[PDB]
Structures are given as structure tokens and as C-alpha cells.
Amino acid sequence: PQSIDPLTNLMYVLWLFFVVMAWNWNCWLIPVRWAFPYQTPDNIHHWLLMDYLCDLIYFLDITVFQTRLQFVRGGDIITDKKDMRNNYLKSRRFKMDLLSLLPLVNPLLRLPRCLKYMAFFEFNSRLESILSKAYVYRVIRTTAYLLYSLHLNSCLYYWASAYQGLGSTHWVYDGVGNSYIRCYYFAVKTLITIGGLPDPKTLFEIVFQLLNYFTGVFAFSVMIGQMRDVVGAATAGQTYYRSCMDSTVKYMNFYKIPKSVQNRVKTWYEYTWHSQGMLDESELMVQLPDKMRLDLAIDVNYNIVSKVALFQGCDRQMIFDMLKRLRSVVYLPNDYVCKKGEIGREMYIIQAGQVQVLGGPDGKSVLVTLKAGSVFGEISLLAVGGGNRRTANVVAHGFTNLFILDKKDLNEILVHYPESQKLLRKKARRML
Amino acid sequence: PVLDPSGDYYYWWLNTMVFPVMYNLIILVCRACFPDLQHGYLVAWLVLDYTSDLLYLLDMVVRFHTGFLEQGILVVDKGRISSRYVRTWSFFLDLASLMPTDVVYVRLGPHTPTLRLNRFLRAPRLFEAFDRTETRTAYPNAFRIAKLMLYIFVVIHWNSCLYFALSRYLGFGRDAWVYPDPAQPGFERLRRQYLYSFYFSTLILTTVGDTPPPAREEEYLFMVGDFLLAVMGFATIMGSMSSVIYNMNTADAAFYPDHALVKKYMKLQHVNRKLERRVIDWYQHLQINKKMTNEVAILQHLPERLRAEVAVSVHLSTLSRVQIFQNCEASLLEELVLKLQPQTYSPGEYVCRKGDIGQEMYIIREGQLAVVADDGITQYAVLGAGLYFGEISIINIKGNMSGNRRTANIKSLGYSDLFCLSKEDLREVLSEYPQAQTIMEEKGREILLK
Amino acid sequence: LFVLDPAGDWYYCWLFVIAMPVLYNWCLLVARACFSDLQKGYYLVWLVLDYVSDVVYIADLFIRLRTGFLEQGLLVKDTKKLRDNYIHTLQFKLDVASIIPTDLIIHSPEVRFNRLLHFARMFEFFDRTETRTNYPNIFRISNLVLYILVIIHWNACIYYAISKSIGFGVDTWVYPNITDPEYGYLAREYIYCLYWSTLTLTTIGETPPPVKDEEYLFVIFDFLIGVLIFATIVGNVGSMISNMNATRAEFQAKIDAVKHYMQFRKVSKGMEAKVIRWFDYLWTNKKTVDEREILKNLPAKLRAEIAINVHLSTLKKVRIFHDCEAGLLVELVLKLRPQVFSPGDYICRKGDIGKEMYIIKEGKLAVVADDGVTQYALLSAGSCFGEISILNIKGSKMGNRRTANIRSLGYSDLFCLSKDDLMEAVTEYPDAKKVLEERGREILMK
Amino acid sequence: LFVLDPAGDWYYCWLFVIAMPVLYNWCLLVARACFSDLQKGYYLVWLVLDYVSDVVYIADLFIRLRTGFLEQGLLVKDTKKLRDNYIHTLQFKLDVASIIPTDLDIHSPEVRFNRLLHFARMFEFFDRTETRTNYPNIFRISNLVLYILVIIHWNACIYYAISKSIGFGVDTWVYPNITDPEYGYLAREYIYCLYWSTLTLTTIGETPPPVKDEEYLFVIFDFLIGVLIFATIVGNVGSMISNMNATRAEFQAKIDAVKHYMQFRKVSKGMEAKVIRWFDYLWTNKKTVDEREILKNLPAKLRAEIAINVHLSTLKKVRIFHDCEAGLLVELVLKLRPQVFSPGDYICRKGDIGKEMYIIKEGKLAVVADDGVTQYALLSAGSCFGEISILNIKGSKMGNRRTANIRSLGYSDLFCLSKDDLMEAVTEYPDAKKVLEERGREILMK
């Protein structure tokens, strides 16, 4: 690919993953090789092979993948290769990349290789955008930060133990067994501030422990607090619904509402939360911009509003206007959507579920059982003066979602299109 | 006399009631767990004991004389108060609180702290006094820290009493975990007995550790419960203490809110250094003089009727000095304080310029404003405080040249705060009071002449 | 053919019946596997209980085959559809694996560990109980405490199993040798391991130090798990207990905000007490919570049913209501707003145009003259006033203004309806307008 | 004779000058008195530092007497007015007592404890620096770390002072004997006491156990105030970092909510990809913040005038505003609102009613016709469009309807102006629409 789009390219995400893996190798293996005596003349060949592969991928990123990256300027996307190279040159990312790639055997000589963290942040952002359920990845990265802090403390403790005599004092590391595990054990006890270590004796040991405990309390608290923030943000929606249901139940128990009404309210809350995944989506709708909210509305409801019997092909623009105006609220089963006596003030379109028109002697009979993608209630709204009542009672055979159009909004769109208004009223009169 | 729960006399009785309750809460468990404490000061306990029961008896009488609100009107009839009180569960709890243990006191022993455990049932009276104090206290955050600190000390005190009680049952000197043998010179005294128990309870509850290892199966169970209590219940109290600090953070966020939010938008745009400096200099003032950015949000909490009255007393000096105000009945004042909007003006900033249609009444709460000519070389006059200007533009004046346009431009001499009132709103004020219309008519025509 | 309703009370009962064998298997099978003395003392007790758990598990397969699901908003009673729906789920594979007897493939805990896979019913039972319980706050505390105790119990069994693998008494870290009578019995070995696990997970104290390199790995693993998961469950418990007192906090948080306002503004001490007294009234009667914000999620129809039943006594006293049309009762309760007035406050002033009408819910109002001591008529509970200003009367003496000022005696709660909203109800139902106008004509003659 | 301005930067510079001697007096006076070796070894250093500090304390008397105050919005140059403001308040009595001579041993530091009373200038500098600094959160953390380090330093001095009263080496709890060479040198004494206090205050533990009754009371008291410190460290530091990242967290919460709405509505991928791209466009360019939300607290006159500065390039490019040279621009810019359109989205379409006029800020908009592949005209940033439709003209082919489709070739940022606000501008100036009509006429036949 001559042009790579940063936002959507799975190949770019994979390359960012590879660069992050190389950077993680450098940033994790530099302290170990600097402090521990894990670098031998036999192992040094393997170390140089791995470092050569990491340097090769660091070089290839700048050479190819960062050179070929599409950009926008003034709302215009640019594909031209020379302009792409110029834009990559005119960036902070290129400066950071070159600063990391400067050459500068001492294992601490490769220290400037860890300056490449723009790649880590962009890889985090790309995986966070593409991958669903990213809260588990947030947890993973936070606990990875904590484990890296423990690793540095384990290496610093071994460095201090090497600077002093090994086994000279009780605090200093004696040397028996695997070196990394015991130093990591010292790190876990001090950073989590558990306690129980042998007491320092020499002034150097005392100042080491004092600084380690002080940095430990502040940093460990921050890392734990970030983990609490992440898990709270993960559970925030369930907490929101639980708080609303708790408040409603407490209020309705305080005011001694009857148990049947309490059970119906609880059932409505439970069903709407399981179905919708949210309560009162209108607030999220108003946080989103007007054009995006409208486009979402058209995309979700065009099939339902277009496949109706009343207004089929009359006016595409009026279809869009009703797509703006429509709202939805779940109706509980056996509830009366409308009653014959009540004056009709709303038009209902069935998104899902089944409603039954009730007509007959003493009612209690079903004339037509309406299904999804149908309309009812037009007679009361569209009449001579609007004073005509509902012809028949309509009930929900079961849980159903209706699209509600207000009388005022529908009349407002009717005054702009009297020609389609004429056909709509003609059909409403033919029904009777 | 019949007490009023809203009255201050009932509040002082609640604060008096907590002192016998605290003695009942803390000393009684200490006396039961520590045998040397009871026998050491047997005379001194009985004097404080009888005072506690007599105070509990007096609390019964006060309950019968405290009125209850029916239909928004306090009830002073003692007969109907007593009928309500005996129906409530509090009277049944209060009867058991002072249920006489003297009939079984002598049989069990000379004096038994364990028999007076029914005094614990008066604890809801203490919690009510904590709620009433917190609402009317001058410093709320200081009381919440003090209240949470009192709960910490009581919990540690109860745990320290239980540790000594279990040590005596197991036997002193049995192992390292239990209390040491009294044959040791230091641990003979009673003062060491409590301090060691309190020190032992502090180490576990505050998660410090550094405790002798348990050696018996009973001791392992006690440490599991103490460790489990420390991890959740203690962390809950400290979790509430951090919220009190966060409440102070929110109050600090209430002072000059969104200060950093303004900076980051300004810095990213970097439109001008001089306009940024004016914004910073204005924002820096309001930290010094300590103006609240918006008082309307604060008054929104109060009801509408109480919203107007509170705003009257704050600005009473300004309202009286205005020659319009207090025409008759002192009733126009309640209407106008709600409709007025506060505004702050920077020096050299023209409140309204010549040739512009002005919609704001511009009464002067504070600060000196000098009306000036369009050239600005000469100022016609300066208005000290409590004066009106620009009123000609709103009122319709016969024979007025450029009635919508402002005849003069006014510039604020120093820092100033103003109350601005919309044109349509002022017509409503004039419609209610004919005298206010006359004052605008006579004053507005004179300045047009000169 | 029997179809069980998922939301019915019979299905909720069966959730409790299946949950207890799941909880029995999750807590006691690992203890029986690790502690060898637990079975050999109590072989007859576990054999009877384990057969009970097996019978409930297989009966759960039959019940889940007869459970109903919601299709097109309607509960499904077709048995063929219920069978076709269940089999395709992954959950049917897990419940099948719970009942397969590994013994046919000795009686011991390790061969019965496949029954742990049926844990889905336990979590569903906790979710369903929390919604239907009286106080969900105290239940969610108990649910998180149960997770705390299970983790400690499981970690105690792992430590005893690790000690048996390395050996008993080989080093200080492991449990000392069982052969010694002091340490060799069931009561001490579970209890000390419970003490060891509680101290390690909570990071509160110091165990005897590890000796071997494998023991260092387990201690590091236990400490990190305790901080990452056990501490997080603990922090969730502490926050939600503070959420119980948070209901007192936001009403207080209003009070601290405004008290700081009059302290800076140097409000007079006489008006200091009036705001405090008003605030003390609100929390005494617990009226600081507003139903408009707390019921905004429910639709208009469900809000109407709640509003009628809450104020049933007051709405029955209104003259405009109990009418045959009944459209006023549904429509007006959403538009009505409550307001509380201080004693001595003027509800309305004589000679002022009124934008609203008022209905008494609680309290006493008296219409007064200029002095305010004299009273003409007492406004009782449920009375509606303000009709003269909103509705024009023919030949009005006051010119559509309020005839007389009304002063409140004691605290009163008023329901206010704006004139524009009332005028909408006037246009839809003409008869409701006439009965209010007829009442106004009688009071205009007075 | 000069009057310092409280708002001036020279006053802030003096605030830094006064703060260092106060901080030196707090940290070192309690360390000089408790440690006898510290005062003897560096006796020449303390003489110079104390003399330097004492002059700055005295110099604060002259500055505070000449510090201005704002009465009636104007600062006062009168010496009598400045003197009467400060010589009467409580701070003058505290400040005089800070600089009283100690003649009534002078070189010893327990008699110079009266310099601690001037803590008002210390707290004012930290409060003033928070507003002036560019990064308040990091400075707030640095201020809090300084506060904690003072108590630890103060606790170390008290612990050594207690050990000197009881005696060194008489029990395990106290600091060991000074006569022993290992514990003799001053660096060992100060570090270990600092090490001791940090362990006790932060509830680390590992301190030697107390022996005598007097030591029990001090250790218990240190632990109780220690958990107050731990609440601050967990509370303040954790909240500052959480509030530091509050901007990102709000945007991430919005993305998850829209994604959840995507699944429930079964939205098509092409729309879902379009939604996440437009969100990613805002996040990269950092335009997701809205200026009208932030600037709503700031008063209107300054708020309106900063808005003309941000959009000055676009407003100057407007031919309508530049040619008329009237005063309608100052009010319309506040009414003007921003809108962002994705590429391929038609801003306007023929046959659609128009209620707003749009002025391009940064976008290559096209006047498309028919399918939209061909463009009737090309539109550039700074060119207003749609004003023929909303202003109805008698000599028009069509009324309140767009004559041609307007589409965005790329991501376009534009500003929307509603019809009602333009009507407000017409009441100020009616001549603008007649000039726009003549330009609007020539579009009709072309």
C-alpha cells in the first residue's frame, strides 16, 4: 500500500503492535542487563541478535511506515508521497524517533531506545478504538504499569546489593537461589507497604528503604486508584440503572404505592433496561450533534417509516421530518394505549410487538390484530376540527415499542405540505 | 410550657443528652471487661451512674412536652402529644432503656456493670443530636471530621476491651499473644492494662501489624475477625474522611470555577496576549475580593419566596439609596430583586456607548462610573453609588431625539458591579407602580434638556 | 405440557433451589479435596448431600427445557421452540458437562470437580434477588461479603495443598508436620490456614518467611492477587456504605454551599435563622427530594398513575376533578408543581395579577385584610383558589386581578398550575371551565 | 513613598521573598533545638541565615503598611488610609509579636520560636501561585508533598526530643546511645529519626516496640494522626490525578455509550464506521471542547469580545460584515454557533426548507446538482450561503427553499446563524437585506 490511513489500517495497527513489542523488550531488558549479571560472553550473542532485530524494526518504522501515512490539512486528505514525507518530517514524532534512533559493551548504552512512547500511545488509541470491551485492556495496561514498577524496584534493589558487599548485612541480598525472584519479593513487600523485612543497619540501607517506602506509598496508591477508576467506569452504567431503580423503589415504598403498581413499574424498568441497554436515550441524543443524531434516526427508522400504509411515497422530505419528530417509549402488556372516550392527541407507529384493536358488544373482542410496521390512531388526529374521539380501544397483546408522533409536530409538518396533507386526510376519511 | 423541636431550647437539650449517653457507651463496656476498674473507683462510679439514670428519666418528661407539627401548626396540648408518643416505637425503646435493673442488681452482686446494658438503647437520641448540630454549625467540615474521629476511638476502645476480656478467660502469660503475666512489674498497674490493650487494638485495626503470633485456636479466630473488621469497616471510615477532604476540594472548585478551563482554551487558541492578560487580571481580582461567580445557582436551592427575601437583605443598602425604590407598601422590592442580574465591569470598559440601543437599567450597587462625552476628553459627571443611568432609552419620551440610541457613553472609572434589568421587565415594573413612571418621566426629560 | 414464566415467582423459587447445590460445590468440594481428614470423618454426610446436588442439577436440565423466552414481545409456549432455542446456546453445553458422571468414565472430590461448571445459575440468582429484595443496598453488601469469604476459603485450601506437595514440617513456611499431636487435627489445620490466607490476602501482617524458591513465587502471586482483586472487592464495599450516607450528603451539600454564601454576604442574624429553620423543616419531614428529577425516566402514563395514587386524598377534594370526563386527572397531574411556604408568608397579594391557581395539599391559609389579623374565610384542605385571575368573569370588579391577599398561618404545601397550561385544559374540555367560572361568580358576588 | 498594587506582579515577587524565611523558620527551628549537634557544628551558618531572615520580617512591616486596598473600586494612595486598615486588624498584633526582640540565651533557638507566628504570608504564596501558574494540578501535588514532608520532619524532631528526656539506651524503643560510635554522628541521628517517623506516620510498621507507659501514649497518638495523613495522601493525590485526566475520560465515556446504542439499534456498519471516524476527527484536532460551555461563567461583555478575536480571520473575510461597516457584528458573533460536518454529508439540498444561514470557516464546500458528482458552483471558506432562502424576496423563483444542493467534499467546519437572530439584526439595520437581495437576484437567472 502506497498510502496508509492511520485510523482504519489493520496493517498499521499490527505494525504498531510490533513496534510496541520491541519497545517493551528494550524497556524491560535494559534494567535486568544493567543490574543483574545475566549478561555472559556466551549469552551476549543472543543479546546482540535480539537487539539487532529491535533496531531493525525501529529503523524500518521510520523508513517506510511513518513515511507513508495519509494526513488531512484544511479538511483535505493528501495522498501525494512527497507531501507525506514532508509532513512526517514536520512533526514531533519524527524528532522523537530520531532522538531514540541516535546511536550514542555496556547494557546502559542503549538507554535512549525507550524514548519511543508515541508509538505506544498511538497503538493504545488504535486498539482502544477498534477493539470492543476495551475496559479489560485498560485493566491490563494499568496492572502492566504496576508490574513494571515492581520490576524496576527489584533491579534497583539488586543494584544496591551489588554495590555493597553481598551477604555483608541482613538487609543486603545474601545471594542463594534465583536472584530475580527474591529481589521481586523484596519489591512486592516494600511497594505494597506490607512490612516484615529485616531492618536496615548502614546509613545507605536506611536512606534506600526510606526513599523506597515514600515513593512506594504515593505511587502504589496512584496505581491502585487508577485501577479503581477503571473498574468503576466499567460498572458505571449498571450503577446508574441500579441507583435509579433503588431511588424509585424507595420513593414508592415511602408513599405506600400499591404492590401491583410497584411490580408493574419494576417490570417496565427491568424490560426496558434489558432491551434498550440504556435508560432515557434522549440525553445521549442531545449530547451527540444534531446532524449525527438525525442521521442515526434516519438510518434506524427509514424502513419502518417508509413501509406504512398512510404515507407511502407522498413526500420524502416529510418522511425525514417525521424521522426528526418521532420518539419511542415501551408499553407494558395488557396496558390500554388509547381508550374510546379519550380525545386523541398522539399518532402511534408500532416498532415491535403486537397490539390488538378492541371492538364489539361490551368490547372484549379483537377486530384486527396489528403487527410491527403499522400505524393506528389517525382518525382522532385527522378529523374535522380534531374533536372526534378515538373510535376503538387499543391494547398491547404483549411488551411492545411504539413510535409516538405529537399532534402539534405533525400539524406543523402538515402546514408546510398541504398537498400531501390532502392525500393523508383523504385516506383517513376513506378508512371511516 | 411546651417545647418546640424547631426552637433552640430543644436543641440545647439534645446536646446535653449526649454526655450521659457517651459515659454509658464507653465506661460500661470498660467496667465489664476490666475487673480492677470497677472495684477501684466503686464510689466514683455510683455518683455518675445515678446522674445518668436521672438524666434518662428527665428525657422521658421532655418527650411528653415536645410538640409535633400537624397541618403545619405546632401542637401545644399535652393530651394529644402523649397519645402520639405512646404509639411510637421510641417510647417502647425508651421504657426498656431505663428498665429498672435494681430488682436483680442485689442478687447478682453488690454492683454489676453487665446488668446496665439496657442503657445502650438510648443511642438514637445521640444520633439525632449529631444531625441537629451539623445543620446549624458554623463549620460543617470540622464537625464531620470530629464525628468520624469519635467513631474511630470508640471502635478501638471496644476492641481493646474485648482483647483484655479474652486474655483473662484464656489466662495471663499462657503465650505471647495473650496479655502478659501480672508478675511483671510494668503490667501490674491498671494504667498499663488499658494502654497495652489500646496499643494492641490500634496495630490491628489500623493495619499496621507487628503483633505477637497466635498460638491457640481461639486466638486464631479472634485475629481473623479483627483483620476482617479492619479491612472493610475501618477503610469505610477513612473512605468517608477522604470524601470530607473532597468536599473541601469541591468548595475550592466553587471558588473561581473553571479557572484552568479558561486557560487551556485561551492558550491553545493564542489569539492575543493582551486579551489573555485582561481575562487573567479579571479572574485574579475575584480571588482577592472573593466574589462568588454565580449567586443565582446558590439562590436556586432556596424557594422562590425565600429567594427574594434573602436577596433583599444583602443589597438593602443599595435598594434604599435608589430614589425610585420603596414607592409605597415596600412591595415593589420583592419583585425587582429576583429580576435583576448582577454584572461586573472592568476599567475603561464602556457600559453602553453612544449611538447604541441599550437594554439594561444599570443601577449601581458599587463602584464609581463617570458619564463621558463621545470624544472622551471631558466627562459630564461621575455617579458615586446607588444611582441610575441610561433609563431614557427604555422609557418612551415625547419629543426625544434618537430615543433608542444612547445620548451619552458611560465609562467605568475603576472596578464596578452593576445590576442590569431588561427593557420588557422594566415595563412590567412601571405597570405595577404609577409613581415609578412619573419619576422616570421627570428625570428623563431634564437631562434631555441639558 | 408445562411452560414456566421467567418473570414469575415460581421461576424465582427454582433459582434458589439450584443455587444452594452450586454454592455447596463451590465452597466445600475444594475443602474436601485438600483436607483429607474432612471426608474420612464425614463420609456418610457428604455421600447423602452429593446425591441431592446431582438430582437438582439434572432436574435443572428439564426445567431449562421448559423455561419460556420472549419473542416479538410475547411469551412463547411452543415446546418445540423452547427445545430448539436451548440447544443452540453455549450454556446447554456447560450444563451438560456438569451432569456427566466422571465415575463411569472412584468416589472422590477430584473426579467431581466438573460440577463447578454450573456456576451460571448462582450468579443469575444473585442478580434476580437484588431487584426483588426490599433493601438492595444491604443485599449487595452481603453479596460482596460472600465473594470475600469464598476467596479466603479457597486460598486457605490452596496453601494447605501446596504444603502437602512440598511436605509438612520440611521448612518453616509450610504447615508443620501432622504427625505431631499438637498440629495434627482437622480443627487446627483449617483454622490456621484460614488465618494464613486472611493475613496474606489483606496484606495486614507478616507470615513466616518463605525458604524455597517455589514458595517465593506463591507468596508473590498471593500478594499481587490480594491487592488487584481482593482489595478491589473491599473498596467496592466501602464506597457503597458511604453511598447510604450520600443520600444525606447532597441535601447537606446544598446547605453548606448556601451557608457559605450568607456568611460572606454578612446577612443579618434575624434572617440567618429563617433560612436555617426552613432547612430544618425540610429534613424533619424529608421533603427535600423532588419527584420530578427522581421519576424522569418513567413515561407520561406511568407517571400519571403514580401521581394520582400519591395525592389521592388531595385530588379527590378538588371541585374540577371527580368529573365524568377524567381527562383533567390524567393531564394536570404532570403539569402541577409543588411549593412549600413559610408561616406568615403571603401566598398572593391584593391588587396583583395572578399567573397561576393553587390547590391546598397540606396546611391552613387565611384570606386577610391590610392589617392581616382579620380573617374572612379559612382555606381548608383540598380547596382550590386563584380561579378569578386566570379565568375572566363577566363584569369583573377587580379587572382580572386578585380580589384579596392571602396570608399563610403555619407551614403549608401548595400545588401550582400555570394559567397557560390551565387554558389548554379549558379548550379541550369546555365543561371544566364552566364549573370553575360558576364558582367564581358566587365568590364575586360576596 | 510608594503604594504597592495587590494585583501587580511586584507584589507577587515580594510574596516569594517573604515566603522563604518563613519556610526556613518552620523546617529548621524545630531541628536546631532538638538536635544539639546541629546547632554547634553549623553555628556560623545559622548566624547569617537568622540575620537575613530577621531583616525580611522587618521589611514586611513597611510593605504591609504600604500595601494598597481597593475601596469603591479605586486603590488609595493615602498613607493614613493604608495605616488605619492594617494597624487595627489582628495581623498587626501577630506580625509585631513575630519581630519582638529576644533579649528579654539569644543564640539558642528555643527563644526564637516567636518567628513561627508569621504563617499568614506562607499560606498566601501557595494560594497565589496556584492561580498564576500554568499547571495547577502538578503544583498542587508539589504543595501537598511539601506539607507532608514538614510533619515527618517535625515528627522526627519530637521523637529525638522525647529520647533525650527519657535517656538514650535505657530501653529498646528510644534512639540508641550517642556515646556509641556507630550512632554518634549527626547524619545517622537525623536520617534514622526521619526513617522512624515515616514508618510510624504512614502506618508502615516495623518500629521497635514501646516498653514504658509514656512511650505507649506517644506511639498510639502518632498512629491515630497517621491515618489522617494516609487519608490525605490517598484522597488528595488520587483525586488530583483523576481530575487531571477528567477531560479524556468524559470523551471515552461518550464513545462507549454510542457504541452501546449501535448494538441495540442494529446500526449498519457503514454508518457506525462513519460515526467513529467523525469522533476520531474531533479527538485528533482537539476541537471536541465547546467554547460556549467554558465561557458561560465569564460575563457577557468580555465573553463577546474574546469571541470576535478567535474568529477575527473569518469575520474579516465576510463580505457582508466588511462592506456594511455597521455595528451588528458584536451581537451576531455571540449568536453564531459552530457546527462540524463529515465528508459526503449534504449540508443543504434543493427542495428542502431552510431555517439557518451558514458561513464557512474551514471547508471546501461544493454547490452540487442532480446526482452530486457534478457541481453547479464551487464554494470557499469565508463565503456565506443560504441567505436567499431564509430572507424571502418578492422577486424570487422559489421561496424558503434551497435553489441548489450544498455538499461537503471533505471534513468541513462552518458556523451556523439562525433565522431568528438575523431578524434581530434586521431591527437594528434594515438596509443590509436590500443589498443582499440585489446579489440574490443575479443568482436566480444564473
Ligand SMILES: Nc1ncnc2c1ncn2[C@@H]1O[C@@H]2COP(=O)(O)O[C@H]2[C@H]1O
Ligand atoms: N376496523 C378497523 N380496522 C383497522 N383499524 C382500526 C379499525 N377501527 C379502528 N382502527 C384503528 O384504531 C384507532 C383507534 O383510535 P383512532 O380512532 O384515533 O384511530 C383508529 C384506527 O387507527
Ligand SMILES: Nc1ncnc2c1ncn2[C@@H]1O[C@@H]2COP(=O)(O)O[C@H]2[C@H]1O
Ligand atoms: N450629566 C449627566 N448627569 C447624570 N447622568 C447623565 C448625564 N449625562 C448622561 N447621563 C446618563 O447617561 C445615560 C446614557 O444613555 P441615556 O441617554 O439612555 O441616559 C443617560 C443618562 O441616564
Ligand SMILES: Nc1ncnc2c1ncn2[C@@H]1O[C@@H]2COP(=O)(O)O[C@H]2[C@H]1O
Ligand atoms: N371572602 C373570600 N372567601 C373565600 N375565598 C376568597 C375570598 N376572597 C378571596 N378568596 C380567594 O382568594 C383568591 C385570590 O385570588 P383570585 O382573585 O384569583 O381568587 C380568590 C378566591 O379564590
Ligand SMILES: Nc1ncnc2c1ncn2[C@@H]1O[C@@H]2COP(=O)(O)O[C@H]2[C@H]1O
Ligand atoms: N451559481 C451560483 N454561484 C454562486 N453561488 C450559488 C450558485 N447557486 C447557488 N449558490 C449558493 O448556494 C446556496 C444554496 O442554497 P440557497 O439557494 O439558499 O442559496 C444558494 C447560494 O448561496
Ligand SMILES: [Ca+2]
Ligand atoms: Ca504491615
Ligand SMILES: [Ca+2]
Ligand atoms: Ca498496610
